[PDB]
Design a binder for this molecule. Structure first.
Ligand SMILES: Nc1ncnc2c1ncn2[C@@H]1O[C@H](COP(=O)(O)OP(=O)(O)OP(=O)(O)O)[C@@H](O)[C@H]1O
Ligand SMILES: Nc1ncnc2c1ncn2[C@@H]1O[C@H](COP(=O)(O)OP(=O)(O)OP(=O)(O)O)[C@@H](O)[C@H]1O
Ligand SMILES: [Mg+2]
Ligand SMILES: [Mg+2]
Lengths: 367, 332, 342
């Protein structure tokens, strides 16, 4: 009786916003559908079927993992992860259900059948479902249709309430192009409202894909790739992951530096602080092709190796305060927005650690 | 003898010796109280089927029950392990061999044990591992409590109590308790309850897929479920294992042991959901007691001293003197 | 007796390597021998590792520690012959009315001789996973029923189980931990931090102990209460290069001792011939890859020399460095005049 009051205190939209910044339309959609499920105002005869279309490494697996962590205390048993890139051939279809009688691994059964037996209402996630040929997806047709799966032994498992989540990278380029168009148009109307000196109207930064674009391109490309309209029919909701925006990337840089500062304070009482130009240099390495993975690895290659070298060199005393700074001779290069020649090599501006003492004296560290 | 049973009900003894399982203990206590009042049907013995996961306490519950009903377990407790009876011919370990064959004069083991004590509690331990034919052998033992030996002799055990522990439908009820772990703990007395339709709509397909006979499940009087341990039950288990070791130390060499409220959290952190009370038991036995034995060899623990388990700012054993000064022990 | 020559030092002199494994085994043996062990539960150890590490020899030396004599208090069952479901009767004897009922079980008779014995289930991963229901019964309380129903108590026994499951996992993670330790050690050589004594005890991390090893044991053994009843799980790491040097030195000590007992032929060697013996080694075959290699390089040459009576007795030998990349048995004289033998 206290679960609805707890969710009234801390809804999952705030929990997911704390865990993952950006794409608040996706958060609102998954929160509303989950709220319909967990309130009880939901048709139990069919499972909750999510499809996420996104770019590479945008946080879809993190979103499903945090959803399963919110739903279940144990994510080892209450959450299932399956990589569809491995399951190219129809032979891998067998390991959903196990072999027929008379064959090898008949007593083994299916891994998925035993996994749904061990947790019938688990959050189940398949990543990159476009990699698998839809002959694999033909099992999941009836599995999303009625929640019942038949194995090789003939035991029928019934999971009518399991949240089944698909995540895919298909049509990521078209969503990226259209969302770049919408970002340019929204910046155009924002600058029009600025130039008309109208500040009474307040519009939040919520850009949502319109219906006509979806009906024009997304349903035909999904029908063409999946080659089966029936598999697209059982999907309870489609969700679009918009490509990364500037201010949320800045907030991402702030949080991925803040986590290292918090773990430094937790382990060795090391208070790390940052600069705005440090955040600019870290957000400069933004690659859409790797998604947030490129920014995270750029953060690692820039500051994590330097902080590790300072830690193993024992040059960070306990109880001290540290500041991450940009090199002085590179800020002048940052201040010049000139187009570089293609025959000149590009130099990454270095990052340094400064010690702030009790007498407000800056100490430099070079290793 | 009603005064003695009013002084010491078996629920008090069971809660004194095993923790958790407030519904299973109450169920077996209600059945044993029905036996104690003299208003059970004297033609039919009591049959129990225990459904629980690993390390929950079914075998210990049967042992403590048969310790209550009979003072000697060498006569009043007959335990047969079904791990031998994996094959169809293993049936011949209950009854005697047919006449003219090997071991015919040796007789039936279960018939001899029931003839030694007809009131004795019989524990069919781990009845998952039995062959389905052995189930049909003890079909008549549950139907009337009457078993025919290989020599033509026939033993009656209408007054006996039959306990079986099983592992077959242990996952699903645990999964059921999983939502109860997200409901009964979030209901905040508070209790963890298994729904009444569950035992007939879902559990009976597993019981029919494993035991395959309607008559075997019909002959069993009571189906007793065992629920997985909660957080407070794991706390009580940690304190019970530590109190067992402290009592053993005080009985052996007069060594007082202390643990704070904060110490039990890192011991509950050493727990497997697939395991049971034995995981917490040997985790206590390894992490704490090995340092005690190492200090006891090294003569670092004189008798009458007071020891405190402290979490590192590792479980460190600190000697507490009368002057409130902690002394760390350096173990080689 | 334990305070001067414990299990740790005798095991380290008899078996090289496996510091944490001997530490865990001797800690549990210490708590058993002090009298601070629980009487109900017999000790269950599951030994995991690659091939040629020394788990069977560790169990043999533990059994010789319990009973100074051999052949009596050491009951070893090899689960290569237990790969069928119907081999359970080999534990317990035949049921009444069937062939071999009067002979009883062999395990029952051997635990009837002595109940405090060291029982070694060797290569226990090879057994069919219905045989281990008897292991459920025996590890639960320590009692075993015969063909005639005679329940034998076994509460003073020590059960040691050796296996090869997760051998690739343990070996590959130990190789990664060795690589990372060598990287940070080479950095420490670069950083000149020699003022801190480096405790070179590479152990398996608890995340690796709990997230990959427990699922693969659950996949091979196919039961959860079985892994619950196992008290201690002891891993075995593969050797590092210093351990190979110590092992080749120990084996050459063994062969020099054998020659001294046979015809008093004192034998000597050098560091470089030990290094070229360590070069002939494979990580999969383990210490056996060392052992026969000596017989493929050294002892065959001594046997060939002794067949044509070239070593009458009392002579001193030395083994040298090959020049083909740039083994020789050399008799050294009392005047230090070496002579090569063919
Ligand atoms: N509820 C409990 N309270 C206290 N101690 C317990 C409890 N359950 C188990 N234990 C301890 O753990 C041991 C394991 O229990 P036991 O050997 O009786 O089997 P079990 O838990 O019924 O499981 P299995 O089905 O594997 O036999 C007990 O001997 C006892 O020492
Ligand atoms: N660590 C070691 N130290 C010394 N000798 C060893 C060691 N490992 C193996 N040996 C030698 O090699 C022999 C083979 O080892 P053993 O019989 O103990 O099996 P093992 O290494 O556990 O192999 P497997 O796991 O394949 O059964 C030993 O009898 C001993 O002579
Ligand atoms: Mg128990
Ligand atoms: Mg071996």
């Amino acid at each position: 009786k206290r679960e609805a009051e707890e969710r009234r205190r801390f809804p999952l939209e705030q929990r997911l916003k704390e865990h993952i910044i950006g794409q608040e339309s996706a958060i609102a959609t998954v929160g509303a559908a989950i709220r319909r499920k967990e309130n009880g105002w939901y048709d139990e005869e069919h499972p909750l079927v999510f499809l996420f279309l996104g770019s590479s490494g945008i946080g879809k697996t993190e979103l499903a993992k945090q959803t399963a962590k919110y739903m279940h205390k144990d994510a080892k048993k209450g959450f299932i992860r399956l990589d569809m890139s491995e399951f190219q051939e129809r032979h891998e279809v067998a390991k959903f259900i196990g072999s027929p009688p008379g064959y090898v691994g008949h007593e083994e059964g299916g891994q998925l059948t035993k996994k749904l037996k061990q947790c019938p209402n688990a959050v189940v996630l398949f990543d990159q479902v476009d990699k698998a040929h839809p002959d694999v997806l033909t099992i999941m047709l009836q599995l999303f249709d009625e929640g019942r799966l038949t194995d090789g032994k003939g035991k029928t498992i019934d999971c009518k309430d399991a949240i089944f989540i698909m995540t895919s990278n298909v049509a990521s380029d078209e969503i990226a192009q259209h969302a770049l168009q919408l970002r340019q148009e929204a910046l155009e109307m924002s600058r029009n409202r600025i130039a008309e000196n109208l500040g009474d109207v307040q519009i939040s930064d919520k850009i949502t894909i319109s219906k006509n674009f979806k009906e024009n391109v997304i349903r035909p490309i999904l029908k063409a790739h999946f080659r089966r309209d029936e598999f697209l029919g059982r999907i309870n909701e489609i969700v679009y992951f918009l490509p990364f925006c500037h201010s949320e990337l800045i907030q991402l840089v702030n949080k991925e530096l803040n986590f290292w500062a918090k773990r430094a304070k937790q382990r060795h009482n090391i208070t790390l602080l940052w600069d705005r130009e440090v955040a600019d240099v870290l957000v400069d390495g933004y690659n859409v092709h790797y998604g947030a993975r490129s920014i995270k690895h750029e953060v690692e290659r820039r500051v994590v190796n330097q902080l590790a070298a300072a830690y193993e060199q024992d040059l960070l005393p306990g109880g001290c305060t540290l500041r991450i700074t940009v090199e002085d001779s590179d800020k002048q290069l940052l201040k010049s927005p000139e187009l570089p020649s293609p025959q000149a090599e590009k130099r990454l501006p270095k990052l340094r650690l400064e010690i702030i003492d009790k007498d407000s004296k800056t100490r430099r560290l070079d290793i």
